[PDB]
Amino acid sequence: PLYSLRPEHARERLQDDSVETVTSIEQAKVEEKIQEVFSSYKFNHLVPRLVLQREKHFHYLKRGLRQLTDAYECLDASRPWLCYWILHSLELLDEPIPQIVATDVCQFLELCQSPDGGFGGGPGQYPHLAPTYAAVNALCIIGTEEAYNVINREKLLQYLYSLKQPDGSFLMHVGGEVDVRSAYCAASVASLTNIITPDLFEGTAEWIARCQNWEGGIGGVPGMEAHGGYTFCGLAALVILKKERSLNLKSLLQWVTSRQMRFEGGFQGRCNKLVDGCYSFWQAGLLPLLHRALHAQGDPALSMSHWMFHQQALQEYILMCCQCPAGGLLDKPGKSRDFYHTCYCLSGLSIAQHFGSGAMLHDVVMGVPENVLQPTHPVYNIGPDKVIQATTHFLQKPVPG
Amino acid sequence: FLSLDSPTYVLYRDRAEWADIDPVPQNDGPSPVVQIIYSEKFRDVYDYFRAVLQRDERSERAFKLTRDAIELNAANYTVWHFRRVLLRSLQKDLQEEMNYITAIIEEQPKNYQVWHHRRVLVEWLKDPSQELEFIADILNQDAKNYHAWQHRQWVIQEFRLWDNELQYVDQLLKEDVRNNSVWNQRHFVISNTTGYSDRAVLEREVQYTLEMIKLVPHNESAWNYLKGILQDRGLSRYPNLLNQLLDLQPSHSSPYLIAFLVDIYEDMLENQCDNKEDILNKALELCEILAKEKDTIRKEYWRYIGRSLQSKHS
Ligand SMILES: Cn1cncc1[C@@](O)(c1ccc(C#N)cc1)c1cc2cc([N+](=O)[O-])cc(-c3cccc(C#N)c3)c2o1
Numbered sequence: 115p116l117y118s119l120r121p122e123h124a125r126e127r128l129q130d131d132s133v134e135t136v137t138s139i140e141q142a143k144v145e146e147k148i149q150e151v152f153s154s155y156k157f158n159h160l161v162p163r164l165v166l167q168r169e170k171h172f173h174y175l176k177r178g179l180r181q182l183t184d185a186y187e188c189l190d191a192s193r194p195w196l197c198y199w200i201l202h203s204l205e206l207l208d209e210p211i212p213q214i215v216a217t218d219v220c221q222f223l224e225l226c227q228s229p230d231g232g233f234g235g236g237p238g239q240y241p242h243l244a245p246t247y248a249a250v251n252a253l254c255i256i257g258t259e260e261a262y263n264v265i266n267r268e269k270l271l272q273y274l275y276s277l278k279q280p281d282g283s284f285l286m287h288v289g290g291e292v293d294v295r296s297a298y299c300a301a302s303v304a305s306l307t308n309i310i311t312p313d314l315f316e317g318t319a320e321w322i323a324r325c326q327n328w329e330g331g332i333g334g335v336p337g338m339e340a341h342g343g344y345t346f347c348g349l350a351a352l353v354i355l356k357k358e359r360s361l362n363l364k365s366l367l368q369w370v371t372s373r374q375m376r377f378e379g380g381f382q383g384r385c386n387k388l389v390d391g392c393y394s395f396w397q398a399g400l401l402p403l404l405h406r407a408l409h410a411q412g413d414p415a416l417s418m419s420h421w422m423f424h425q426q427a428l429q430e431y432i433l434m435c436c437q438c439p440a441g442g443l444l445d446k447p448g449k450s451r452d453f454y455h456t457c458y459c460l461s462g463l464s465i466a467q468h469f470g471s472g473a474m475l476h477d478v479v480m481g482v483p484e485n486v487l488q489p490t491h492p493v494y495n496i497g498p499d500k501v502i503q504a505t506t507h508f509l510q511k512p513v514p515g
Numbered sequence: 516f517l518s519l520d521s522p523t524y525v526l527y528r529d530r531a532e533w534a535d536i537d538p539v540p541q542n543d544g545p546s547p548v549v550q551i552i553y554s555e556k557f558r559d560v561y562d563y564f565r566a567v568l569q570r571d572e573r574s575e576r577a578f579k580l581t582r583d584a585i586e587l588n589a590a591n592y593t594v595w596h597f598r599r600v601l602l603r604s605l606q607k608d609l610q611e612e613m614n615y616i617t618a619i620i621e622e623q624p625k626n627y628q629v630w631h632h633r634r635v636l637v638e639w640l641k642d643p644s645q646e647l648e649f650i651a652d653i654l655n656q657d658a659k660n661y662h663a664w665q666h667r668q669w670v671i672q673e674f675r676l677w678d679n680e681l682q683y684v685d686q687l688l689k690e691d692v693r694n695n696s697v698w699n700q701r702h703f704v705i706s707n708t709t710g711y712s713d714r715a716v717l718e719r720e721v722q723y724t725l726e727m728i729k730l731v732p733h734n735e736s737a738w739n740y741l742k743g744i745l746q747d748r749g750l751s752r753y754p755n756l757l758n759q760l761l762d763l764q765p766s767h768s769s770p771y772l773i774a775f776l777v778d779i780y781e782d783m784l785e786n787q788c789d790n791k792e793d794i795l796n797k798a799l800e801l802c803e804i805l806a807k808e809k810d811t812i813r814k815e816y817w818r819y820i821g822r823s824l825q826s827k828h829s
């Protein structure tokens with residue numbers, strides 16, 4: 115019944131060839147900890163039931179959306195993210211955003227918006243591409259005429275241009291660093307608000323492909339190790355610019371699929387590193403992207419009902435190991451809950467239980483049927499309906515200049 | 516001067532040399548959202564940072580204040596930006612600043628801002644003298660720190676310090692041959708120095724990799740490296756590899772060896788090989804074994820490879 119509890123699964127435990135290194139030891143430690151969770155039912159003599167704690171997760175989010183303890187002082191420069199993560203989690207849990215909350219969020223992101231374009235981490239903070247991606251996304255989840263108008267489109271385009279580099283990349287912020295995240299953030303906000311000029315992403319697709327390395331995945335900058343966070347940013351950015359073909363899609367596919375842990379069931383962000391609930395999105399989310407990329411390329415072998423990753427196993431890892439009894443989700447057992455992980459663990463679960471390739475549509479919901487979440491768009495990670503709604507709305511206005 | 520965690524630390528509203536300035540509290544609007552209930556020390560420091568930022572006061576006390584703001588939230592890029600403004604405007608000793616950032620990175624190595632700041636300093640002083648060594652100490656605490664490896668690659672590329680890096684790679688590979696970051700660094704050094712076209716180097720590299728594989732058959736890093744340096748020109752371009760791998764299959768077997776075999780067959784089936792009939796079956800058999808027994812977690816992927824191989828070699 116449950117993939118992770120079957121006896122054969124025990125064979126998937128790490129084989130260290132009797133050669134111990136920091137990597138094997140740490141992989142073994144986490145595996146031992148995950149095995150405990152898996153066996154706890156046989157141990158306590160209870161029949162296993164995988165239940166997503168909606169009610170608990172809802173209170174956690176509902177409250178965080180309003181106020182947080184000093185434990186989040188370190189996110190004082192990431193408030194638009196907090197809005198996005200929470201609003202999106204509630205969105206996935208299919209919980210409505212009272213119009214009074216929506217307007218306060220809209221008003222708050224307004225204070226965050228810079229006079230010169232983009233959004234900052236909080237009121238009066240300089241603009242930065244990461245919080246700009248978060249705000250636009252947050253505003254789009256709300257999807258009202260009020261939210262949409264918050265975005266100063268002319269200044270946004272202007273800000274995007276101030277970050278563009280000759281080699282095709284973008285700075286995260288003025289006087290800041292550059293990496294593939296900026297490429298995605300820029301492409302994401304520019305596409306949704308329809309401000310893409312003919313030369314805005316000149317050479318971007320090319321710069322991103324330079325980030326794909328020998329492993330098949332994508333690194334932060336050319337020459338860097340392949341990582342799930344940057345790989346999602348790279349491929350997703352390319353899908354927006356309709357240039358996925360610029361990548362060796364086959365080595366990428368082989369790389370991401372190998373990132374799923376044979377034992378844990380979840381994903382790691384880099385080869386020879388530990389599994390982590392948030393990568394249920396960054397890594398597993400790549401599969402829908404490649405599925406679509408290959409299909410538009412005319413691939414005749416693509417499955418008609420599943421993504422190219424073990425959906426059941428990823429749902430089992432998330433449901434058994436990533437929930438906090440108090441509400442919220444996390445990295446792995448032993449780690450503390452946080453909204454970031456709550457947002458991406460749920461996003462990842464959504465992907466794992468929802469397949470769609472044109473006319474075909476097939477679901478897989480492990481545990482109780484109430485576990486099924488709302489679908490999420492693999493490129494923007496907001497509801498497919500919010501995507502369509504926002505793009506349709508911003509196409510009513512012309513591209514600035 | 517007065518450490519933020521010192522027993523005699525005093526809030527800024529209680530400091531004589533700050534009586535003239537009125538702090539500027541943060542405006543979260545009338546109906547706050549994701550409102551953080553900051554501690555006393557925190558909002559005191561930022562209320563005054565906001566004051567100094569608005570007035571755009573480029574003073575030494577402002578400079579000292581940014582340090583406290585940074586310590587409370589090293590991720591506040593706005594504060595780091597103002598600090599760099601003061602560094603130049605006040606003409607601060609940059610080596611002194613190098614000492615400072617060295618210390619903060621030691622404390623918080625998994626932070627984007629601290630590394631970017633160091634890069635800006637190294638760029639300003641045009642001095643990479645202490646970089647390779649500083650990074651080695653960080654990497655000594657966390658051998659896989661992404662920021663550290665990215666900084667290392669930057670310093671090496673910009674100042675052309677390649678001469679000793681392959682040796683450093685060998686040192687760390689000996690420490691942990693499973694460190695994927697080191698294998699990446701290995702590929703980084705070789706492709707930017709000699710390259711993988713010099714047959715002597717490709718020879719040396721594949722021999723070393725195969726050697727590490729014999730020692731640790733289940734280390735996916737050695738395998739990914741072998742595949743990455745050979746997939747370029749095509750795996751079927753090297754006829755001896757196929758059977759050589761088949762030689763250690765009864766003993767040094769792993770789902771990693773099985774998969775490489777499949778990778779060698781599909782390149783063969785794509786480059787006009789003898790007995791295409793038999794190879795396509797060999798491939799489809801391995802795919803099945805993987806999807807059903809040896810590597811079931813990737814079953815959907817292996818059934819796809821099986822199908823696609825049929826779709827084009829049936
Ligand atoms: C490696 N890793 C794997 N799981 C988590 C991590 C991060 O170390 C990590 C992830 C992404 C990036 C990038 N870029 C940098 C670090 C990480 C920890 C963490 C905790 C919270 N939290 O709420 O307590 C919020 C954020 C956060 C804040 C702002 C933006 C983003 C984003 N994106 C994430 C956190 O981020």
Ligand SMILES: CC(C)=CCC/C(C)=C/CC/C(C)=C/COP(=O)(O)OP(=O)(O)O
Pocket residue numbers: 244295298299341342343344347382383384387388390396625659660661662
């Ligand atoms: C839109 C956007 C901002 C996307 C970025 C997503 C993302 C998850 C980036 C992570 C990059 C990073 C610094 C990883 C290494 O940290 P680590 O060593 O702690 O992680 P690891 O050990 O799991 O590799």
Ligand SMILES: [Zn+2]
Pocket residue numbers: 390391392393445455
């Ligand atoms: Zn995580």
